[PDB]
Design a protein around this motif. Structure first.
Motif, short mmCIF file in Angstrom:
data_model
loop_
_atom_site.label_atom_id
_atom_site.label_comp_id
_atom_site.label_asym_id
_atom_site.label_seq_id
_atom_site.Cartn_x
_atom_site.Cartn_y
_atom_site.Cartn_z
N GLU A 94 0.82 -1.24 0.00
CA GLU A 94 0.00 0.00 0.00
C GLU A 94 0.85 1.29 0.00
OE1 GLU A 94 -0.76 -3.05 1.86
OE2 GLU A 94 -2.43 -2.42 3.17
N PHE A 95 0.38 2.33 -0.69
CA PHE A 95 0.97 3.66 -0.49
C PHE A 95 0.53 4.24 0.88
CE2 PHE A 95 1.27 8.34 -0.80
CZ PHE A 95 2.58 8.50 -1.23
N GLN A 96 1.43 4.97 1.52
CA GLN A 96 1.18 5.52 2.85
C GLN A 96 1.72 6.92 2.74
OE1 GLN A 96 1.53 2.83 6.36
NE2 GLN A 96 -0.36 2.55 5.14
N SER A 97 0.83 7.91 2.63
CA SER A 97 1.19 9.34 2.47
C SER A 97 2.45 9.73 3.28
CB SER A 97 -0.03 10.21 2.84
OG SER A 97 0.09 11.57 2.46
N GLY A 98 3.45 10.32 2.62
CA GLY A 98 4.67 10.80 3.31
C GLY A 98 5.83 9.84 3.58
N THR A 99 5.63 8.55 3.30
CA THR A 99 6.66 7.50 3.48
C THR A 99 7.07 6.87 2.14
OG1 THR A 99 6.07 6.88 5.79
CG2 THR A 99 7.10 5.15 4.45
N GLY A 100 6.10 6.78 1.24
CA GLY A 100 6.19 6.00 0.00
C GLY A 100 5.50 4.64 0.21
N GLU A 101 5.83 3.68 -0.63
CA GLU A 101 5.20 2.36 -0.52
C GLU A 101 5.72 1.58 0.70
OE1 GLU A 101 3.06 0.51 -3.03
OE2 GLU A 101 2.61 2.38 -4.08
N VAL A 102 4.76 1.09 1.50
CA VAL A 102 4.99 0.13 2.58
C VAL A 102 4.43 -1.25 2.17
CG1 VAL A 102 4.57 -0.46 5.02
CG2 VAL A 102 4.88 1.90 4.37
N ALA A 103 5.29 -2.27 2.25
CA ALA A 103 4.87 -3.65 2.06
C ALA A 103 4.71 -4.31 3.43
CB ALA A 103 5.95 -4.37 1.26
N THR A 104 3.61 -5.06 3.61
CA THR A 104 3.45 -5.99 4.72
C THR A 104 3.78 -7.42 4.20
OG1 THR A 104 1.76 -4.64 5.92
CG2 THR A 104 1.70 -6.95 6.42
N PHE A 105 4.70 -8.11 4.89
CA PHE A 105 5.23 -9.39 4.41
C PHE A 105 4.77 -10.49 5.38
CE2 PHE A 105 7.79 -7.87 1.06
CZ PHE A 105 8.71 -6.92 1.43
N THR A 106 3.94 -11.41 4.91
CA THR A 106 3.45 -12.49 5.74
C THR A 106 4.35 -13.65 5.37
OG1 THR A 106 1.17 -11.68 5.72
CG2 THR A 106 1.51 -13.91 6.43
N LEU A 107 5.28 -13.92 6.28
CA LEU A 107 6.46 -14.71 6.01
C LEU A 107 6.01 -16.11 5.69
CD1 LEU A 107 8.71 -13.30 8.80
CD2 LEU A 107 8.92 -12.95 6.33
N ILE A 108 6.74 -16.84 4.79
CA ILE A 108 6.61 -18.29 4.51
C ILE A 108 8.02 -18.86 4.62
CG2 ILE A 108 4.60 -17.98 3.04
CD1 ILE A 108 6.48 -18.36 0.63
N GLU A 109 8.19 -20.06 4.62
CA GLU A 109 9.56 -20.56 4.60
C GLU A 109 10.07 -20.45 3.14
OE1 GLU A 109 11.45 -21.54 7.36
OE2 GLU A 109 9.98 -21.85 8.85
N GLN A 110 11.37 -20.35 2.98
CA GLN A 110 11.94 -20.05 1.66
C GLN A 110 11.74 -21.19 0.61
OE1 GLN A 110 15.92 -18.02 1.61
NE2 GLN A 110 15.79 -17.87 3.85
N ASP A 111 11.40 -22.41 1.05
CA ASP A 111 11.01 -23.48 0.11
C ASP A 111 9.55 -23.37 -0.30
OD1 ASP A 111 9.71 -24.49 2.46
OD2 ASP A 111 10.85 -26.35 2.64
N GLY A 112 8.89 -22.34 0.17
CA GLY A 112 7.51 -22.04 -0.23
C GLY A 112 6.55 -22.65 0.78
N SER A 113 7.01 -23.56 1.66
CA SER A 113 6.09 -24.11 2.66
C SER A 113 5.64 -23.07 3.70
CB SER A 113 6.67 -25.44 3.35
OG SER A 113 7.74 -25.01 4.16
N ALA A 114 4.53 -23.34 4.38
CA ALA A 114 3.96 -22.39 5.34
C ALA A 114 4.89 -22.14 6.52
CB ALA A 114 2.61 -22.92 5.86
N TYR A 115 5.04 -20.87 6.95
CA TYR A 115 5.76 -20.60 8.20
C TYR A 115 4.74 -20.61 9.37
CZ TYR A 115 7.91 -18.26 12.21
OH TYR A 115 8.43 -18.09 13.47
N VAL A 116 5.01 -21.45 10.40
CA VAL A 116 4.20 -21.48 11.64
C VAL A 116 5.12 -21.10 12.83
CG1 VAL A 116 2.64 -22.83 13.21
CG2 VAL A 116 2.76 -23.43 10.74
#
Lengths: 313, 313
Positions: free
Chosen positions: B69-91
């Motif tokens: 999302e764009f956030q006035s005055g900061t530029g683009e902010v990404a929210t990252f919902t982490l997964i494991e790097q092999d693509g499997s779910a992070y718990v």
């Protein structure tokens, strides 16, 4: 004494020809059957071949002394007098290029940075394009220790020569054929991968390269015979080999499912028996287990595609 | 059965905390003596600790579902919902974050690209800055599976959410202390490295991070206890351990020169006895050889600096 393999799943491994994770495991009968890959090559006895490095960080990277000049109408051209990536001198020898040097063709985008020697080194960074294949009027000799790259510029840059490291950023017009290492002349090469029995095909560990289109990027597949942890395993173990190949099983150890059997030839490449004509991919979460030594003519259990649909026509 | 080490020289190894070659080998008594590193941690029996991955390509990288999302005055902010790097779910589990997640602080520049799944995936790429330490009013929880980064912009960008991989580009204000993994709360951690005997100090495998100054880059040192090939070696071998530590010799095998003796504790860190006060570095072209099991109180032969000059004063 009996060779064993590390119980490491393919999706947890490092790729041996492009520096990224392994993402895929498959056979494909429509790809070249006997690729000449110079990286990711080791024998089960631990004999490294071609340009194969120990470290995965070395894969498809290089180091050099860089001398930069502006060249009217092209932008900056760097001449790179190659060194080995540990900083030691590169001498033309019994392999095609410095360890880990790219062993495919096309146009490689490289990021070139001042070598890191100690804390406070001032670092510069420039992106260049380098053509890997035989081109075309000259002049590229990685085997002799000399290569060229450039970046497009209207004007010149600040660039002061020095020792650099180059990492791969993207590829353009990728072709999985070896580059011209020696400017026409014979050069030392690991041999084509093979032979296979009739019906036997190369097991491929796959990852993806960022492939550009000026804009347009897209993933491009690149395959290698063993991931880098298996390379390093066999180089470190230097096992005693007893017969032409090893029978292996690929198994999901969480479920116990046997997925397939395959033959690891002593010369460091794996075969499966499959008669289909399209790509067949496999799950990446099993492990390989050594079963026994087998002769070259041992006949494997075939695999096939799990989709059974067919038309009368 | 008897533990052995791979005969791989330090300068040929992969670093275990920043994804680059090992360049240096040293002790330093003026650095923190008992670092809490979460990556590059394994015991000689093969027990992995903290966030330590098998593959060196995973080191200090992450994967996520990214919502932009764009956030006035900061530029683009990404929210990252982490997964494991092999693509499997992070718990959230028994370790501080997804495998290979950075285990140091400062401001990390990450390059974030669309995940590579198959040939022809359209790929996007954005650079972001992410703050790793405890900041400061919120809100960073890699342990719970959620982190934030941004890139400065006057206006908004095209950015469509999806699965991404993030690799580290540079660091700013690096501090080698663990980040706030859990927003104040206790979180699962590999323990500080130690203990050492009096006079014993941590052997460090070193590489360099590109450290920026808006401009000004410069190399910054980062150390780890074992290079990644030794991590992967011990995880794969799962040796039986017999006593508190292993006596090792570090030797140049081309000349035969014995450089020093050191103690590899079973808990996966190496000690030397050195009483000097400054950094002492060692050549990176020897190998380690296992000598025998030894008790915790085994007293090592000391080393010192090879410069013997002193002033009367």
């Amino acid at each position: 004494r009996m060779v064993d393999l590390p119980v490491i799943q393919p999706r947890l491994c490092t790729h041996a020809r492009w520096p990224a994770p392994v993402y895929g495991l498959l056979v494909d009968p429509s790809l070249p059957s006997n690729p000449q890959w110079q990286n990711g090559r080791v024998h089960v006895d631990g004999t490294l071949l071609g340009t194969t490095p120990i470290s995965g960080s070395w894969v498809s990277c290089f180091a050099a002394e860089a001398a930069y000049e502006f060249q009217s109408g092209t932008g900056e051209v760097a001449t790179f007098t190659l060194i080995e990536q540990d900083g030691s001198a590169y001498v033309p020898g019994d392999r095609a290029a410095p360890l880990g040097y790219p062993d495919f063709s096309g146009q490689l985008e490289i990021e070139v940075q001042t070598e890191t020697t100690k804390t406070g080194d001032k670092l510069k960074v420039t992106t260049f394009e380098m053509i890997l294949g035989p081109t075309t009027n000259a002049d590229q000799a990685p085997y002799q220790g000399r290569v060229f790259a450039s970046v497009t510029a209207a004007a010149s840059l600040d660039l002061v020569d020095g020792r650099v490291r180059a990492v791969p950023r993207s590829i353009y017009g990728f072709q999985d054929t070896i580059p011209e290492y020696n400017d026409g002349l014979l050069v030392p090469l690991a041999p084509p991968i093979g032979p296979f029995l009739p019906g036997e095909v190369l097991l491929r560990f796959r990852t993806y390269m960022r492939q550009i289109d000026t804009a347009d990027a897209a993933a491009e597949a690149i395959d290698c015979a063993l991931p880098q942890e298996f390379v390093s395993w066999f180089a470190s173990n230097a096992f005693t080999v007893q017969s032409e190949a090893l029978l292996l099983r690929y198994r999901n150890t969480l479920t116990g499912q046997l997925l397939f059997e395959c033959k690891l030839y002593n010369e460091g490449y794996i075969a499966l028996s499959y008669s289909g004509s399209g790509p067949l991919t496999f799950p990446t979460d099993g492990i390989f287990e050594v079963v026994s030594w087998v002769p070259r003519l041992y006949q494997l259990a075939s695999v096939g595609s799990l989709a059974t649909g067919r038309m009368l026509k």
